[PDB]
Amino acid sequence: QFRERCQELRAELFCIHQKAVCEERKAQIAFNEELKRQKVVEEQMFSKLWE
Amino acid sequence: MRECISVHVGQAGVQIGNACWELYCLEHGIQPDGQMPSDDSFNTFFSETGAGKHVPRAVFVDLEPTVIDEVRTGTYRQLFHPEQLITGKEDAANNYARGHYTIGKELIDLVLDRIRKLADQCTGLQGFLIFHSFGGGTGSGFTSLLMERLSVDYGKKSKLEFSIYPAPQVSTAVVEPYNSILTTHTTLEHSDCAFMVDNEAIYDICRRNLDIERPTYTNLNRLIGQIVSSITASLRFDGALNVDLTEFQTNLVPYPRIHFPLATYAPVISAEKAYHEQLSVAEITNACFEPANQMVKCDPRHGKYMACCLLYRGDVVPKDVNAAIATIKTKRTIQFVDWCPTGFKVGINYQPPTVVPGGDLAKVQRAVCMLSNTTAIAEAWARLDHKFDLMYAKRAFVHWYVGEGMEEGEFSEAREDMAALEKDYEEVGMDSV
Amino acid sequence: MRECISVHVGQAGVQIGNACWELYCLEHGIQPDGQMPDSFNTFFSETGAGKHVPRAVFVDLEPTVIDEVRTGTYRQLFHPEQLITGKEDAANNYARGHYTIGKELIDLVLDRIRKLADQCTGLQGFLIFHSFGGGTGSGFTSLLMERLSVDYGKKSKLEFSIYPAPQVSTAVVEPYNSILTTHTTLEHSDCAFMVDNEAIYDICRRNLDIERPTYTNLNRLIGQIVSSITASLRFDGALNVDLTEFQTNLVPYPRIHFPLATYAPVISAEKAYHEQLSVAEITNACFEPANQMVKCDPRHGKYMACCLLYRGDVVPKDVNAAIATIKTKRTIQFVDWCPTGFKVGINYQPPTVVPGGDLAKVQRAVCMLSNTTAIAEAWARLDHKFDLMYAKRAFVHWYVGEGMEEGEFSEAREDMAALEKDYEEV
Amino acid sequence: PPCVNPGNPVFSCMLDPKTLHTTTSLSKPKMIMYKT
Amino acid sequence: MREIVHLQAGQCGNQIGAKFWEVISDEHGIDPTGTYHGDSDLQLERINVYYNEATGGKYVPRAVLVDLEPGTMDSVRSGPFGQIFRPDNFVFGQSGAGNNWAKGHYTEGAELVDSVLDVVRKEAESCDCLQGFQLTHSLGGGTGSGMGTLLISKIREEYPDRIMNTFSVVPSPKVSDTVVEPYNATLSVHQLVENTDETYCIDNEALYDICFRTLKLTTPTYGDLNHLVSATMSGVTTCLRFPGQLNADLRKLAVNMVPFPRLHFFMPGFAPLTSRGSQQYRALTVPELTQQMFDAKNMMAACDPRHGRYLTVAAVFRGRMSMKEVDEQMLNVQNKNSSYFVEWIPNNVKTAVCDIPPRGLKMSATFIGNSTAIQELFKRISEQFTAMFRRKAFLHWYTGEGMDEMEFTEAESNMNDLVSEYQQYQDA
Amino acid sequence: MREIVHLQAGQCGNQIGAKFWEVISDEHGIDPTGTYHGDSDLQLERINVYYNEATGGKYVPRAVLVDLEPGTMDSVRSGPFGQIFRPDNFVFGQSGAGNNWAKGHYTEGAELVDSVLDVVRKEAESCDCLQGFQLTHSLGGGTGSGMGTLLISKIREEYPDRIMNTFSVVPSPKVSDTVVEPYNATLSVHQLVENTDETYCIDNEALYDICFRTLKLTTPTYGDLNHLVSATMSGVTTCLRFPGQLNADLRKLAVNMVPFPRLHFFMPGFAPLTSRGSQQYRALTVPELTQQMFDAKNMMAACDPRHGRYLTVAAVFRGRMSMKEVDEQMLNVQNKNSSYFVEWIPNNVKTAVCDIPPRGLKMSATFIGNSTAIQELFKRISEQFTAMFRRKAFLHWYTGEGMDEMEFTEAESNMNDLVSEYQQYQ
């Protein structure tokens, strides 16, 4: 709680949260890429039902 | 040991609360049925029973049984107390006089009975937190009776409402200007603060800031979910500098009749776009005063800011925000009013925001919630007052309102009430030498 | 902290920009993902991770040219917000880009320049690239810079204005857009450079030996010119020279902001075996009028001022025999009020080898930036071509029917008439 | 009969909409025709 | 928990509702005996709206069928979905009327409506909270218009503050089907303005013009027409049956879009209509649907809207669609066509969103619209009435057994008063 | 992204456009069932310029098939790719025109335009930001010329800015297809001069002259004749669908095409078109194209450029080729043939280079010839007009429909005025 403001709060807390923010976002880029696959197969389901 | 009671009324109000209450459960780690997966942060929006069950502090009321059923039989079945989650008898059907006189009257006694049974379990109560609309009958007329009864039953409790304003250009209801004028007699002296969230913000912020096209209301309500979680988190999560609810009221509001702030959630960015830039305190504060990011369709350059309240979340250092405020004060374009030279707050919370599954927001190191009081919301009524008097001039759609018991003269009484409120923003925008 | 915004408007802007941002990645060590496989403060603005989005605002009014830039290999590199797209072309017409499809997009791109300018705290100037061909590169930029001059202004408006060729052209209203943008360049441009690309059409098969050269070849060689003048900022040097230090040593009077540049060691691989690269020799060879990219003959155009970049293994003693050799050779033209008129640009770092690009691994990249009176000859022929149409008013109707007015053509004459006289009376 | 009158001017649903179902890795399998 | 009561009259109203009870049965998954062969839990939660329970599983309709001629009374029962109705609900006269408005209103009308009023109060007593009443009939015949009139004449006596939606087949613009349709219409319209809360007009060859140009089917029977009008019928009453982010039941669908308590004559219409030949060629999205929603060729009334001005319109939407772009494009309808909309109501369009579409369609919509263009029907049918009343033609079957000509005179005056009020509110 | 819609009118027009829609589908990789089959992404790219997306990957040829005869409609719809056309865009009538220009203009012409402009509006509202309109027709054919004449006088008031083109088949300077042509040609070209922004004159005979020697084909049936005009159409619009280094769309063309807003009748032409016995030798490269662009035998309209002067000739190229090999092989032209070239416009050349070629050929170009000499083809049909008109040969069919001889003189006077302006500007 005092070496935070020369050190550990930076480069051990900010650069590790940022390390999370990088890898954590990759799930959202993977999860949303699955929900876009929902719509594109739903349209196949609405194409064969329209057919 | 301090807590905030919420009430959500109207179809608009109940579904923006479903986005509010999905976020409350995913913030504190609470399952959709009530029990903790296995603190005191629950005791602001959640009551802890003998088991792990966390009954929500809200009461959802609406006169349409249709919209209340899908939350009665949805995935939040076991969460809500089934007698809290109260239904109606018949639709208010887009009529102020219906929701105020004839069909909303048989629900006041049961709603106020549940607010009493909820406020006595309360021990350190700060104030109410209202959720309604301006368009429909039960979003406007039924909440009017609520402000009528809560002002006399409680009094000194500070109530806040997150209203959804009628949009200036698009609109979905024909007689909703009538409903957005008569409600103003009961949101002026019966409401302590009134947040306005128009359907023109996420109309285009979800298009330009977020790369997703064609948004719908389940994406509209998440941004309204994020802001309320940002405001109450100072009551709820620890910080280097916290802003209580009563802290927030007396500071942002100048005058007893001027309590109509704007809103802005700055770090609204998509997942595929967020890693393309760093989100600093100075950048996310400069991106929040921009006229393409406010929550109401009104240009802030026409008006002058009275006082702005800023709530930061997560990883924010309290020197960069002071550098951000000084950098954004020295620009000439954002002009403040002369009689309030400071015009600013800061508020720090340690916990970063959560993102719901399926959401288009990307989670951030830091999130700022800018809550600005402007006199540019004077012309928020200008495109509604001209919207009003054109319909009123030839007695269009008046026979329904006077047919339900409402007197004709109460239309013009609300007309002059808003005309006086517009005069107040012309009075405060004049400099004194 | 010595940074620059590389604005790229029109087609020939961003086509140079891609060839620019290719070699900009190599020298700063940046993959097309923006990450490393600070010299990159000047460009490649810092982000949260090891990614670096380029300091640029890629503006186009036509959907297509910016699109393969967008879906190219630099898709991660080139940030979508700085990748401004348009829908309607300017029809190679100054009037359309400046008025009709002007204020339509000028609001977004001023915001987009400003957004990166917030990160750009202590910046040097704006690297704006445009042709004299059409309203995307002629009219929109004239609207852009005058907006950029009234907002920022003091920042260097150093402009890579691609000039129309003395004989060839893509257009026929090429003299129109040129004679309009050149006179608007006079009121709002700090150190506007000149890219004629007609001697580029010649030295390609001489110094590069690329027979059948294509647009790419040109832009790559132009991008090396932008690199050498700015490598002083990003990298280090014994006499490295700032962008402010270029302009207020080179431009003598405010209407003389039109020098000519050329790469000196343009030697490619097949000659590079037989070439003795010695710093004094190449800059001596640089002055030879067949090599300057601007076609207008410097051999008669008096050397009013002259700057000399010195990139690579350049030695301070060896650049003084370079000055002396040019001095004793009196047949090379000189001005009569600057005795020396030189600016030495020592830069330790050697030029990059673009992948596949024919510029060989020459150890040194001496360059040269001389303000000559020769540019009046390039103006006169451009002025002459405009007169032939404007004598009997051909093609004016497209222009005047798209937000413009016939007096602007006439006033473009008078402002051009002042412009040759700036480069004649001195 | 999947529908009531095969060949309506408006529309005739000649597919059992029970088999019409999509899901996410982390979601429940819900049907398409029926929806909220 | 609220419900609407269906009730049909005449040969037209019997056939229209018989197809309507057949087009909502598959929507709620009901076989032709009454059992629930469905696949969704939100198909049975609002079954109390348009159905009611019996001794386990069996869902019986709540419609009363008054029909003065029994020759089309057995037609509905003998159909595929005719066993679903309870038989004692059926009420019929021994002898037909003969297409007299007065004979179905005065002399044998009163012999039956005591029983018809008896069976509607029997069913409405059992309902928990009644929301409205529903009628389908035609103006051009005595058993439909006259019997429908006498029902409405005293149902407002006992249910004053309950809404009424009636789907009335307005008589034919071009080629007429009975020679006394000017007389039957002008007394029905006189009695359809003061008591009905909300009405629909159904031009007969607007259905024929749809089935020729839009649907392009060579041999259309009445079953194809009856299915098309009933698709609009189901689209009206969907929001109080299925959830949504913005729903509009019948009470909301009327009291915010009738400006004045006597102007309630609307333009119905179903949005997604495609031929066989052009069905793979049409995309399914909101912007293409609205270009089919608002055009004159895809309308349920033959009178164009280009000769008048829209006062209020309503467009209920069914299915997931992002309706933020619905508000975007519908504004583009407002801006592109401003002279066809009244300027004294800047907010002319209305939305409603239903969460589920009709079964199998990706998304669907129903058009409700009030216009001053209704005048070109009423101003002519007044001219048809005046061209036949002044010559004392076809009158002794009305005057000779029922009312005098004073009721005929005040029927013309009430029409001509309605003629003047639409004109004076066309420009405001 | 900018898009156009076809407006094929008459038997002449519907056959050309369908063969054009044939070639467009082949280059974009589309089948008669509309499903995409292109082996890359460039065949899609901007598919909205011609094709509207439907369910199942289907692409409808955005085009309304206006006519007055069921027989032409039957032939096009029953063609190999006839299925892909939308049946709602098959608006047609039954009463024929009889090759009378009036009958296709007022009796059933003016009774079907309301329906056609309704489905013209259908395409326009559906597309987002359109670029213009395209309309194939003849000059001497009554429903082709006449109905097309009334469309271009109706869509132009509906959509002025969208530059609308006609590939009008100008009548023969020899063997006549009907007897009615000088009447129908003169009347329509009286409106062609003041309706369309760029009219493409098409002579059947000079188009035969291609199949005479350039293709040296033995018996050319109308199939490749339509294919021949379709080749020029595809390459004109190449900068709107296909990536290109010098992307000059029709918007970039027309402002360099028309020097005064009366002159827009410029003869088109394709360029690497050769024969079966000459493909074995011919080398696909830039200079051997310019051989066969600027030849006086590749013109689609007859009106040979020996009897006129090149106002602002242009050629839109296709395929991967040098841009310094084009510049030279397009300036060497002017420097040589200097007479045709009008010295008034110093460099009357549009180098419009597209990156990707037509599929099945490497080095391509579409030369739109802006020679003056089109007025001789106009004075030819003026004499054929007045020789028939002054004697009052057969006009009671016209004057009975209200088409009196007064407007016949106006048509002759305005086109003889159009003869004068082309002749004065040379």
Ligand SMILES: Nc1nc2c(ncn2[C@@H]2O[C@H](COP(=O)(O)OP(=O)(O)OP(=O)(O)O)[C@@H](O)[C@H]2O)c(=O)[nH]1
């Ligand atoms: N934010 C939001 N708005 C909605 C939602 N659903 C509908 N709306 C729109 O918001 C506007 C205001 O809604 P309300 O005033 O609450 O309408 P209402 O309560 O259903 O009207 P009544 O129940 O008849 O009193 C309406 O015109 C709707 O179009 C929703 O779920 N969220």
Ligand SMILES: Nc1nc2c(ncn2[C@@H]2O[C@H](COP(=O)(O)OP(=O)(O)OP(=O)(O)O)[C@@H](O)[C@H]2O)c(=O)[nH]1
């Ligand atoms: N691409 C490119 N163009 C050059 C180059 N050198 C000169 N030019 C000329 O610069 C002009 C660039 O066009 P722009 O400035 O973008 O204006 P434009 O003609 O409207 O081009 P578009 O935006 O594509 O419509 C072309 O006409 C070329 O003749 C070069 O090296 N590369």
Ligand SMILES: Nc1nc2c(ncn2[C@@H]2O[C@H](COP(=O)(O)OP(=O)(O)O)[C@@H](O)[C@H]2O)c(=O)[nH]1
């Ligand atoms: N769409 C439709 N119209 C009908 C049907 N049966 C009758 N009509 C119309 O009803 C009008 C007269 O019917 P009518 O004999 O009076 O039936 P009634 O009202 O039951 O006596 C005619 O114009 C018919 O077009 C039907 O099954 N479908």
Ligand SMILES: Nc1nc2c(ncn2[C@@H]2O[C@H](COP(=O)(O)OP(=O)(O)O)[C@@H](O)[C@H]2O)c(=O)[nH]1
């Ligand atoms: N490729 C092609 N050209 C045609 C065809 N039919 C006619 N033409 C040209 O059009 C001219 C006749 O035009 P016209 O009869 O007035 O056209 P119409 O109005 O549609 O009948 C002929 O001289 C031909 O040169 C065809 O089927 N294909």
Ligand SMILES: [Mg+2]
């Ligand atoms: Mg409601």
Ligand SMILES: [Mg+2]
């Ligand atoms: Mg371009």
